[PDB]
Design a protein around this ligand. Structure first.
Ligand code: DTP
Ligand code: CA
Ligand code: CA
Length: 421
DNA sequence: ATGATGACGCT
DNA sequence: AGCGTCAT
């Protein structure tokens, strides 16, 4: 249980653009539409590195991080679009601007948290309440959920047939008389997300997938279950079966070292197996915060808020200088810091005009033959020569010595600490 | 020769 | 403040 919290207090969605950079290039160049294609950056080394892959190309085994020359061995008719290059480096402006298109549409429906260039969390709890009162007590037609999967259902032999059967079982057992039913609330959430996804596609051309659940972690997991161009509802009730065979690494934030340590120390494989440990046990192995989080998460419960944040908190530029291209002379170091600073100035000035804010700190980070060393200085003027000069100053004293030893394999300039303006 | 980003936690 | 983790 009577006092046992069930993590069913919110409706949260995660919207994720399908193969996003590919869709941006396909909208622009119709010749690429409905074809195996990929987006690459740079071209000289092994045809360039693939950074996005259409679903038609994925069927050939083409993946992210693949060299284009290698992808071509799997998929000889693979089509390619390449990232713009400016000032000697990859320039991602086209994709950031396409991102803004989508985020602005989503923000018409609800408060969003920008999670990445192509993902946003959506807190739908309020929107759902409103739609529930407007719908009187009327049942929800399957026609309102034309691209929705209900995870765990059903419980003919074609994929769409399965989808509908599952949706039918779900709707035919919904308690539409109870405006406080979590399952009803999720369902209405899914209706709204259908509407949001239709509006994005109508107004931009871009397709996306989505997950609808009671928190961000379940929403994100949900989103990945049926892709592309589909959405998945994960109810509280679906969690025990879903987690019983769900590898721990699939849950957001457990994909790395912590997740590996959970597996090794507890000697388990699946998210569900976490339930047999006390909260104190989990905290003993993984710390107070992680332990509490795991104990609740493996039961489908998570409280991280959808933060009201549509804009990035930092604006950064970086370039790697791998192998022999590593920077070995002072003049080399200065010229690239300047290149980075010039892109940074451009993006910052745009940012200040669009969003009425100004960055106040400049963070400089380098690697010598992830980050070796980060140093910050004040950012008082949007001027690329001053920023590049300042960046040099705060890193110049780590030259072991043109000449620059040891060679620099990465330069990175990041503007941070925004104040309103 | 992945590269280019971006949020947040720890001390 | 500077570094590490985890992610797209
Ligand atoms: N490691 C990376 N380096 C550079 N760019 C990336 C990287 N990961 C993702 N991106 C860019 C390209 C993607 O189009 C976009 C969104 O990433 P992500 O959602 O992980 O894949 P995706 O949108 O291409 O495919 P999916 O349909 O699987 O989401 O961000
Ligand atoms: Ca995506
Ligand atoms: Ca994404």
């Amino acid at each position: 249980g009577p006092h046992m919290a069930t993590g069913q207090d919110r409706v949260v969605a995660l919207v994720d653009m399908d193969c996003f950079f590919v869709q941006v290039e396909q909208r622009q160049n119709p010749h690429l539409r409905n074809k195996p294609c990929a987006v690459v950056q740079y071209k000289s080394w092994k045809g360039g590195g693939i950074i996005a892959v259409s679903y038609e190309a994925r069927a050939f085994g083409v993946t992210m991080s693949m060299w284009a020359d290698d992808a071509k061995k799997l998929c000889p008719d693979l089509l390619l679009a390449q990232v713009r290059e400016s000032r000697g480096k990859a320039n991602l402006t086209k994709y950031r601007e396409a991102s803004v298109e989508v985020m602005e549409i989503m923000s018409r429906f609800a408060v969003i948290e920008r999670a990445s260039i192509d993902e946003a969390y959506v807190d739908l709890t309020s929107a759902v309440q409103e739609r529930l009162q407007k719908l009187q007590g009327q049942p929800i037609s399957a026609d309102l959920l034309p691209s929705t999967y209900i995870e765990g259902l059903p419980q003919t032999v074609q994929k769409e047939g399965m989808r509908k059967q599952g949706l039918f079982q779900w709707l035919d057992s919904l308690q539409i008389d109870n405006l406080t039913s979590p399952d009803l609330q999720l369902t209405v959430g899914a209706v709204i997300v259908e509407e949001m996804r239709a509006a994005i596609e109508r107004e931009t051309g871009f397709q996306c997938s989505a997950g609808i659940s009671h928190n961000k972690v379940l929403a994100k997991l949900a989103c990945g279950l049926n892709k592309p161009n589909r959405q998945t509802l994960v109810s509280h009730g679906s969690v025990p079966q879903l987690f019983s065979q769900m590898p721990i690494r699939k849950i957001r934030s457990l994909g790395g070292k912590l997740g590996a340590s959970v597996i090794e120390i507890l000697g388990i494989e699946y998210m569900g197996e976490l339930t047999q440990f006390t909260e104190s046990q989990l905290q003993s192995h993984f710390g107070e915060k992680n332990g509490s989080w795991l104990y609740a998460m493996c039961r489908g419960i998570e409280h991280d808020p959808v933060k009201p944040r549509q804009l990035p908190k930092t604006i950064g530029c970086s370039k790697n200088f791998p192998g022999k291209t590593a920077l070995a002379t002072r003049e080399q170091v200065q010229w690239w810091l300047l290149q980075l600073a010039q892109e940074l100035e451009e993006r910052l000035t745009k940012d200040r005009n669009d969003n009425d804010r100004v960055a106040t700190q400049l963070v400089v980070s380098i690697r010598v033959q992830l980050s070796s060393l980060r140093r910050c200085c004040a950012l008082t003027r949007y001027d690329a020569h001053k920023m590049s000069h300042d960046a040099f100053t705060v890193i110049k004293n780590c030259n072991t010595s043109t000449e620059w030893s040891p060679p620099l394999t990465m330069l990175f300039l990041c503007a941070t600490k925004f104040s309103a303006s």
